[PDB]
């Protein structure tokens, strides 16, 4: 049962520091090279650090170099990056990938990866608004604004209800805050007959809200 | 430092078509490249090793070609789950480094947008903001316009999209446009207009309402 599993992301400073860890399950970290690939929003996968089977070496991008430190701890079986002095741009998904010179030299095992973000807001849970339906067939859903850091998890009707709902990638409004809306299609005839909540979830802030949309008044 | 790019960056394809995606890289790299897919909230998934190895598990339509400094990724017969983007990487020398990605996407019929407009909840207009949703549902292709009329003025820096990732089951993609104002903003006008211009509509198409 081999596997790599990573915990560690999360909201820090500008200039701050955050360590990142990468558990191996069924294979010893110390016979791999451990690399660390990271995934800023929408763009690439880009190298960042590399440590050499047993310890042996350490390899960093200019980007990054003389900022973070790899290492591992062998007992724990658990391989590490740790990032100093933090910048924006370093805010990325995170992923540990494990790596040989033998055969197949390619990335096979990955871990999942964790946000790190990089920012001077502080953690915020999202306010939560209803999407009442105007006026076939029609809509209605939730406005999920002004929320710090990502992500935020939305459902329906306490997960009994996923046809046709679309859960929006969320913006990042220029006040600095994100904000997303979950929305749903339903037939108008079970609608003022079967009632609707949304259930968002913003970990972070340990925000949970649960919404009961209903129609307007005029 | 060896540098991967991948052609092209984007593609649309069919269900069942041959699809091949290019990588050259700056310098020769023997056969050490290889090839993995990558889903939305996903870690990538090796596909091919060494070139032109298929790795163990992956479907036999997967093959890889090439050598020194032009490789080649085929897929045989695309299948519904094989949308992803796919990224070729160089593993000759350290550090290894990645082709920018080529993200595949599902080819299909034109489809309009339902078209549907949310005002601004009484719960929301008590903290001063005032959030309008326009919505565009299960439409095809991506590329779409969408209009805020406000009392008849065009709006220019306040609004903002959304668009879903491609569809499970139709390939459609959905969309939000929302604009936001202050509460005074909002109570000193009227008519609140979404204008929709999409391939899929025969004319565009506005959803108001009155405040």
């Known amino acids: 049962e081999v596997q790599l599993v990573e915990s560690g992301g999360g909201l820090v400073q500008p200039g701050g520091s955050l360590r990142l860890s990468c558990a191996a399950s069924?294979?010893?970290?110390?016979?791999?090279?451990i690399h660390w690939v990271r995934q800023a929003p929408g763009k690439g996968l880009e190298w960042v650090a590399g440590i050499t089977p047993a310890g042996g070496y350490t390899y960093y991008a200019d980007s990054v170099k003389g900022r973070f430190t790899i290492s591992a701890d062998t007992s724990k079986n658990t391989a590490y990056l740790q990032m100093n002095s933090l910048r924006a741009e370093d805010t990325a998904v995170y992923y540990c990938?494990?790596?040989?010179?033998?055969?197949?030299?390619?990335?096979?095992?990955w871990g999942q990866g964790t946000l790190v973000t990089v920012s001077s807001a502080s953690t915020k849970g999202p306010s939560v608004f209803p999407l009442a339906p105007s006026s076939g067939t029609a809509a209605l859903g939730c406005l999920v604004k002004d929320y710090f850091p990502e992500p935020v998890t939305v459902s329906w009707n306490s997960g009994a209800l996923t046809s046709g709902v679309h859960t929006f990638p969320a913006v990042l409004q220029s006040s600095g805050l994100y904000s997303l809306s979950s929305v749903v299609t339903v037939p108008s005839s079970s609608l003022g007959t079967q009632t609707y909540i949304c259930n968002v979830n913003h970990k972070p802030s340990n925000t949970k809200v649960d919404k009961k949309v209903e129609p307007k008044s005029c | 430092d060896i540098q991967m790019t991948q052609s092209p960056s984007s593609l649309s394809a069919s269900v069942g078509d041959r699809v091949t995606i290019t990588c050259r890289a700056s310098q020769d790299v023997s056969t050490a490249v290889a090839w993995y897919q990558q889903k939305p909230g996903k870690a990538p998934k090796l596909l091919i090793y060494s070139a032109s190895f298929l790795y163990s598990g992956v479907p036999s339509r997967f093959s890889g070609s090439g050598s020194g400094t032009d490789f080649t990724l085929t897929i045989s017969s695309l299948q519904p789950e094989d949308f992803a983007t796919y990224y070729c990487?160089?593993?000759?020398?350290?550090?290894?480094?990645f082709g920018q990605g080529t993200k595949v996407e599902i080819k299909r019929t034109v489809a309009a947008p339902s078209v549907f407009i949310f005002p601004p909840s009484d719960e929301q207009l008590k903290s001063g903001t005032a959030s309008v949703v326009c919505l565009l549902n299960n439409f095809y292709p991506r590329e779409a316009k969408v209009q805020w009329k406000v009392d008849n003025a065009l709006q220019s820096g306040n609004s903002q999209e959304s668009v879903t990732e491609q569809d499970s089951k139709d390939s459609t993609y959905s969309l939000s446009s929302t604009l936001t104002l202050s509460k005074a903003d909002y109570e000193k006008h009227k008519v609140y207009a979404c204008e929709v211009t999409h391939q899929g509509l025969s004319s565009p198409v506005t959803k108001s309402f009155n405040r």
């Open positions: 990938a494990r790596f040989v010179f033998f055969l197949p030299y390619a990335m096979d095992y």
């Open positions: 990487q160089q593993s000759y020398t350290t550090p290894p480094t």
């Open positions: 069924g294979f010893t970290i110390s016979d791999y090279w």
